[PDB]
Write a protein that binds this ligand. Structure first.
Ligand SMILES: OC[C@H]1O[C@@H](O[C@@H]2[C@@H](O)[C@H](O)O[C@H](CO)[C@H]2O)[C@H](O)[C@@H](O)[C@@H]1O
Ligand code: CA
Length: 769
C-alpha cells in the first residue's frame, strides 16, 4: 500500500476490506416483517432533502433513498468506476470494474467483474469516504475520496443532490504506465415513479463547458418529456480536465445488453469513441460513460475529480402531495439543471473539502478523546441525510417564508419527527443546523391546539380513540405513505393523546433550542410560549392523586409503551420536574410573572413528592404502583440529564443523582454481558435483567449514548466512555454485529436487533455539549 501515504485519511475512519465478508451479522429479533439489507453498506451521498444514494464498501450504488421516505436496496450494476492500465511497451493492458461482485443476471456480462479480495480498503468518516486500490495486477495504485458538501451552519450546499469523487493515482514502478478511469451511470429516470415503460423517452447527451480556467465534460441523462412529476428530471456524471489528462466519452450504451458496446472500447486502450447519440430509448435501459486517460511516469502522482448530480426536483408522498426539494431554491425547479449542479461541484469541491475539514478538525485534533469515539460521533451523522429526509421548497402548483423539514424515526416505523425519539436524536440539528431544528419545533408548536375528533382503531388492543386532542403534542408529523406535515399522528399502535412524556419533552426541547443557540432567541421563545403553557397545563390535569405529578396509568402512555408505568414514574416524573423548571425560566425571560409563580409552585410541590415517593437510598425506583416498581431503569433520570444540558441546575440532590448513575453503570451496564453492549433498559436489584417486557431486556442505542453524556456531565468520565464503547463496538467493530450505517434502535443480549436505520442514536452528539 503506497497510495495511503499520498492521501489524508483520518485514523478514526471506519475501515473494512473491499470484498470482505463478515461472519457475525445480526438479524431482526421480532416476528413481524422488518428491513434487513445486510452488512454491505457505506456512507451515503447527497444532501439534506435531496434524496440519498448509499454506495457500499464493495463499491456498488446499492442503497437508494431517492424516493423520499423509502428504502430500496438494489445494486444498479451499470453504476461503477472502472480502471484500465497498460505498462508502456506492452502489447495488452487490463481492464477491471472496481466492484467486489457481479450482476445476478446476464446484463453487462462482457465487463470484468469481481474486483478481487485483499486488494484495497474502504474508509469512512462521514461526510467523507474513501476507497484505495492496491492490486498485484494494477501497477498504478489508485484512491478516491468521495463526499457531499455536508457543512454545519450552511443551509445551501448541505441541500445539494451532488457527490464529488476526487481520484488520486500514483506510479510506484520504474516504467511509464497508461491509465484510464471511467465513470459509468445508468439513465435512472423511471427507476421509481413509473408504473410501465420505465425507460421510455430516456435520452442522454454530452455537455462540454470550456470557460478559459476550467474544461468540464459531462453526460446529462434525462427524458424527452417536460412533465413535472416526481419521476422526471436529470442525472449527470462528469469530470474536470486537469493538466496531463485527456477526456473521452460515450453518451449512450445499453444497460440491458451484454455491455460490449462500451467495454470493447475501454478494455482495448482506455479510450471511448466520443459518440454523442442523443436518440431516445423505448424499452432498453441506457447509460453514459465518462473516461479520463493519462500517462504516469515513475513516481508521478495525479489528481482528477469526477462528479455526480441528480436533479429530481419533486418529491411525492403516498397521499398525493407533491413538494419541491430544498436545493431547487438555488438551481431552479424545472428538472433541467443537473449540469449546473455538477459544474458548481467540479469548480468548488476544494473549498467544500476545506469547509468540511474546518468543522471536523477541532474534534479530530483533540487527542484526549479516543479514535473509536470519533468514528461513532461522525459516522452516526449518516442518518441526517439518509433518514428519508424531507425539506420542502413549496408545494407543486402553489412563494413561501419557511421551508418545512422532516427526518424519519426510521423506515420500518415510517413517521416524520417522532417527538419522543427526537428528544434524544435531534442533538446534531440543534448543535450544527439550528435553523432547521427551530423550524421543526415551530411545526410542533403549530399542532398543539389542533383537534381531530374522528376516531381511529388503536392497534395494540383494538379500542377506538380520538385522533388528536387539543393541547396534547402529537407523536409525529405524518408518514411518507400519507401526507407529511398535513396529517399528523400517523402512529396508531397506541394512543399518543394520553402519553405523559410528550408534552414535557416538547417543553424541554423548546428550552434546549434557546439555550444551545446562545440564549439570544427571544422570538423563538415568544413563538412557542402559548404552546408551552398549554402543554404543561393539560399534563397537570392528569395528576389524579394530587401529588403535583401526572399519573402513569398502568397502560401504554409513554415512549416505553409495553414496559408499562403506573403511579409516579422516575422517567415521566423527572421529565415533568425539568419541564416545569424550564417553563419557569422562559417565564422570567418573557416577563410572564404569573406563569413563573405558577410553574415555580407546581415545581416545588412535585419535586418534594418525587423525592419522597421514589428515592430508595441507592437509586430512584421505576415507579410507585407497578409489579416491577423497584427495577433499575437506565433512563430513570432523563429529566435531570436535560436539566444539566439546559443549565437548570439540580432538580434532584447531587448526591442522589450520583448514586443512581453509579448504580446504573454497576448494574445495567457492567452486569449486562460484561458491559460490552451498552445499558440494558431495566435491571432488577438482584442483578438479573427485568423480564416483565421485551423493552426492559433491550439496549436502546440512543438511550445509552444519552446516558453516557449524562455520566460525562457529572464527572463520571470513565463510566461514560465505557458505557458508550459497547454501542460503538456492536455497531462498528469486527467483534460486533455489523450495523455500520444502519444503527438500530435496539438489541437484545444475543446482539440481534430491532429497527435498523434509526434516529435515536444521533443522541451521541449530546456528548459534545
Ligand atoms: O422502540 C420504541 C418506539 O416504538 C415505536 O413504536 C412501534 C413499535 O415499537 C411497534 O412494534 O410497531 C409500531 C408500528 O408502526 C411502531 O410504531 C414508536 O413509534 C416510538 O414512539 C417508540 O419510541
Ligand atoms: Ca400524581
Amino acid at each position: 500500500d503506497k497510495i495511503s501515504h499520498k492521501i489524508d485519511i483520518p485514523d478514526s475512519a471506519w475501515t473494512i476490506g473491499i470484498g470482505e465478508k463478515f461472519k457475525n451479522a445480526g438479524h431482526p429479533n421480532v416476528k413481524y416483517p422488518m428491513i434487513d439489507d445486510s452488512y454491505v453498506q457505506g456512507a451515503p451521498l447527497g444532501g439534506f432533502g435531496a434524496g440519498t444514494i448509499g454506495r457500499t464498501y464493495n463499491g456498488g450504488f446499492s442503497r437508494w433513498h431517492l424516493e423520499i421516505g423509502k428504502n430500496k436496496y438494489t445494486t444498479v450494476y451499470a453504476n461503477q468506476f472502472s480502471v484500465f492500465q497498460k505498462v508502456e511497451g506492452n502489447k495488452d493492458g487490463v481492464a477491471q470494474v472496481l466492484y467486489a461482485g457481479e450482476p445476478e443476471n446476464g446484463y453487462l456480462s462482457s465487463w470484468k467483474w469481481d474486483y478481487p479480495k485483499e486488494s484495497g480498503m474502504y474508509y469512512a468518516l462521514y461526510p467523507n469516504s474513501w476507497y484505495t486500490y492496491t492490486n498485484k495486477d494494477l501497477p498504478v495504485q489508485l484512491a478516491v475520496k468521495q463526499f457531499s458538501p455536508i457543512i454545519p451552519y450552511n443551509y445551501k450546499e448541505t441541500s445539494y443532490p451532488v457527490a464529488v469523487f476526487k481520484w488520486t493515482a500514483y506510479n510506484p514502478t520504474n516504467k511509464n504506465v497508461d491509465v484510464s478511469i471511467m465513470f459509468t451511470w445508468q439513465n435512472m429516470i423511471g427507476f421509481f415513479g413509473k408504473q410501465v415503460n420505465v425507460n421510455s423517452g430516456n435520452f442522454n447527451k454530452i455537455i462540454k463547458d470550456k470557460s478559459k480556467d476550467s474544461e468540464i465534460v459531462a453526460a446529462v441523462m434525462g427524458n424527452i418529456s417536460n412533465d413535472n412529476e416526481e419521476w422526471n428530471g436529470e442525472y449527470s456524471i462528469g469530470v474536470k480536465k486537469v493538466p496531463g489528462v485527456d477526456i473521452s466519452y460515450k453518451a449512450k450504451f445499453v444497460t440491458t445488453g451484454d455491455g460490449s458496446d462500451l467495454w470493447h472500447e475501454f478494455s482495448k486502450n482506455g479510450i471511448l469513441d466520443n459518440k454523442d447519440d442523443e436518440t431516445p430509448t423505448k424499452q432498453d435501459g441506457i447509460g453514459s460513460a465518462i473516461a479520463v486517460n493519462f500517462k504516469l511516469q515513475p513516481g508521478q502522482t495525479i489528481e482528477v475529480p469526477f462528479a455526480l448530480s441528480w436533479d429530481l426536483p419533486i418529491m411525492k408522498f403516498g397521499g398525493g402531495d407533491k413538494w419541491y426539494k430544498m436545493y431547487t431554491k438555488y438551481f431552479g425547479k424545472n428538472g433541467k439543471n443537473s449540469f449546473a449542479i455538477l459544474k458548481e461541484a467540479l469548480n468548488n469541491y476544494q473549498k467544500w473539502e476545506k469547509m468540511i475539514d474546518d468543522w471536523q478538525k477541532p474534534i479530530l485534533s483533540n487527542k484526549s478523546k479516543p479514535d473509536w469515539y470519533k468514528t461513532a460521533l461522525f459516522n452516526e451523522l449518516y442518518y441526517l441525510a439518509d433518514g428519508g429526509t424531507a425539506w420542502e421548497n413549496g408545494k407543486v402548483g402553489e412563494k413561501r417564508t419557511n421551508n418545512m423539514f422532516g427526518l424519519l424515526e426510521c423506515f420500518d416505523y415510517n413517521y416524520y419527527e417522532t417527538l419522543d425519539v427526537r428528544f434524544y436524536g435531534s442533538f446534531p440539528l440543534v448543535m450544527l443546523w439550528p435553523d432547521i431544528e427551530k423550524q421543526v419545533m415551530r411545526q410542533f408548536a403549530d399542532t398543539i391546539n389542533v383537534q381531530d375528533s374522528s376516531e381511529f382503531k388503536v392497534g395494540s388492543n383494538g379500542a377506538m380513540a380520538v385522533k388528536k386532542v387539543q393541547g396534547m403534542i402529537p407523536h409525529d408529523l405524518g408518514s411518507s405513505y400519507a401526507l407529511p406535515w398535513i396529517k399528523i399522528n400517523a402512529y396508531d399502535w397506541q394512543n399518543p393523546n394520553i402519553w405523559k412524556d410528550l408534552n414535557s419533552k416538547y417543553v424541554l426541547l423548546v428550552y434546549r433550542d434557546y439555550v444551545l443557540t446562545g440564549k439570544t432567541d427571544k422570538e423563538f421563545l415568544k413563538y412557542t410560549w402559548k404552546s408551552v403553557k398549554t402543554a404543561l397545563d393539560k399534563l397537570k390535569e392528569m395528576d389524579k392523586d394530587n401529588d403535583g405529578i401526572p399519573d402513569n396509568e398502568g397502560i401504554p402512555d409513554q415512549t416505553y409503551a409495553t414496559w408499562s408505568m403506573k403511579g409516579t414514574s422516575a422517567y415521566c416524573g423527572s421529565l415533568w420536574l425539568a419541564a416545569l423548571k424550564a417553563a419557569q425560566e422562559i417565564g422570567k425571560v418573557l416577563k410572564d410573572n404569573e406563569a413563573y409563580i405558577k410553574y415555580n409552585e407546581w415545581y416545588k410541590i412535585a419535586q418534594q413528592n418525587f423525592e419522597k415517593e421514589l428515592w430508595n437510598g441507592e437509586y430512584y425506583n421505576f415507579d410507585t404502583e407497578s409489579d416491577h416498581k423497584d427495577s433499575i431503569m437506565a433512563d430513570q433520570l432523563a429529566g435531570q440529564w436535560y436539566a444539566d444540558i439546559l443549565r437548570l441546575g439540580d432538580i434532584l440532590p447531587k448526591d442522589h443523582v450520583q448514586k443512581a448513575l453509579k448504580k446504573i453503570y454497576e448494574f445495567n451496564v457492567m452486569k449486562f454481558e460484561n458491559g460490552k453492549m451498552g445499558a440494558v433498559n431495566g435491571m432488577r436489584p438482584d442483578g438479573i435483567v427485568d423480564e416483565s417486557d421485551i423493552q426492559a431486556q433491550e439496549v436502546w442505542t440512543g438511550v445509552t449514548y444519552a446516558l453516557a453524556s449524562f455520566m460525562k456531565y457529572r464527572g463520571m468520565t470513565e463510566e461514560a466512555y465505557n458505557t458508550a464503547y459497547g454501542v460503538y463496538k456492536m455497531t462498528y467493530d469486527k467483534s460486533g454485529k455489523g450495523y455500520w450505517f444502519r444503527t438500530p434502535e435496539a438489541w437484545t443480549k444475543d446482539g440481534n436487533y430491532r429497527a435498523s436505520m434509526y434516529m435515536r442514536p444521533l443522541s451521541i452528539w449530546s456528548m459534545e455539549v
